From Swiss-Prot, chains A, B:
Residue ranges annotated as Extracellular topological domain: 61-72, 94-128
Chain positions carrying an annotated carbohydrate: 101
Gene name per UniProt: TRPM4
Species per Swiss-Prot/TrEMBL record: Homo sapiens
Intervals of motif Selectivity filter: 84-86
Family per record: Belongs to the transient receptor (TC 1.A.4) family. LTrpC subfamily. TRPM4 sub-subfamily.
Topological domain spans for side Cytoplasmic: 20-39
Effect seen on changing residue 93 to A: Results in a non-functional channel with a dominant negative phenotype
Intramembrane positions: 73-93
Protein name: Transient receptor potential cation channel subfamily M member 4
Involvement in disorder: Progressive familial heart block 1B: A cardiac bundle branch disorder characterized by progressive alteration of cardiac conduction through the His-Purkinje system, with a pattern of a right bundle-branch block and/or left anterior hemiblock occurring individually or together. It leads to complete atrio-ventricular block causing syncope and sudden death.
Subunit structure: Homotetramer.
C-alpha cells in the first residue's frame, strides 16, 4: 500500500503534461523547470542554517530524552516547521514551562509540555535559546524566503524569452 | 557548553565556502553579501516600529507584573513574534479574558491566561490596543516585509552583473 500511495503521487504529477498544450501555460511550465537552480541554492543555504541553528538549540536545551530519532526531530524537523509559523514557544522558552527536579545533574531544569519536546530541558542560558529563535526567524523566515523571491523575479524575467 | 554550541554555529556557517566553487552558486553568495544594506534598513525601520508599537501596547495594558525582564519580553519579544503569525489575542484582547478584581487601583481589570502576559492588565481603552495590533500587523507584516522583497528584487537585478 505504501509504495502505491507514492506511485499515485507520480501519476498525478504526470498530469502536468496537459498544461504544455495551452499557449499561455506551456511557457510557464518550461520556466518552472529553469527555476530548479534557484531552489537548490535556497535548499543548500537553508540546510546549512537549519543544521547550524538546530544543533545549537538542541545543545543548549540538553533534553533528557536524547533518543536518536527524537534528536533528529528536534534538530531538523521542529526548526523546519518554524519557517511556516509553527513556533512551539512552550517547548523552548523556559519562562513558559514548569520548574521541576528531573535529573541529579547540577543546574536547574524545566519540564516542557510537548510530547516530543524532551522530558526535561536545561535552563542554564535559556535567554540565548530565545535569542537564536529570534535570529533564526529573521534569517530563514524573512531574508532567505524574500531572497528566493528575488531570484525567481530575476530568473523569470531573464528566461521568459528563451 | 554554551559557548561551544555557539561555536558550532560558526563552524557550520563557514561551510558556505563550498558554494563559492559552483559557477551557478558562486555569484549567488556574492550577491547575498551585497544585500546587507537592505537588511539593515529593514531592521532599523522595524526596530523603530517595534519600539513604537511595543511600548504603546504595554502602556495601555498596565500589567501588574511590571518586572524589568518581563517588560522587555512584552515590549520587544512578543510584538516581534507577531510578525510571524504568533498573535496571542487572549493576552491582549480584553473580550477574551476573565474579569476579576486584582488591584485596588481604580478602573476595571482582566486576568490574561498567558504565563508571561501579566497577572492582570487594565482594560480602560482596550479597543485601542486591538486597533494598534491591527495597524502593527498591516505595517510590519505586510508593508515592511513586502517593501523588503521589493528592495531585494531591485538590488538583485542591479548587482547581478558586477
Amino acid at each position: 500500500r505504501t509504495v502505491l500511495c507514492i506511485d499515485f503521487m507520480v501519476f498525478t504529477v504526470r498530469l502536468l503534461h496537459i498544461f504544455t498544450v495551452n499557449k499561455q501555460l506551456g511557457p510557464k511550465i518550461v520556466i518552472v523547470s529553469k527555476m530548479m537552480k534557484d531552489v537548490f541554492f535556497f535548499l543548500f543555504f537553508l540546510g546549512v542554517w537549519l543544521v547550524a541553528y538546530g544543533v545549537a538549540t538542541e545543545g543548549l536545551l540538553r533534553p533528557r530524552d536524547s533518543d536518536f530519532p527524537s534528536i533528529l526531530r528536534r534538530v531538523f524537523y521542529r526548526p523546519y516547521l518554524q519557517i511556516f509559523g509553527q513556533i512551539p514557544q512552550e517547548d523552548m522558552d523556559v519562562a513558559l514551562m514548569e520548574h521541576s527536579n528531573c535529573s541529579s545533574e547540577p543546574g536547574f531544569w524545566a519540564h516542557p509540555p510537548g510530547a516530543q519536546a524532551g522530558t526535561c530541558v536545561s535552563q542554564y542560558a535559556n535567554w540565548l535559546v530565545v535569542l537564536l529563535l529570534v535570529i533564526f526567524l529573521l534569517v530563514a523566515n524573512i531574508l532567505l524566503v524574500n531572497l528566493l523571491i528575488a531570484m525567481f523575479s530575476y530568473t523569470f524575467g531573464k528566461v521568459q524569452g528563451n
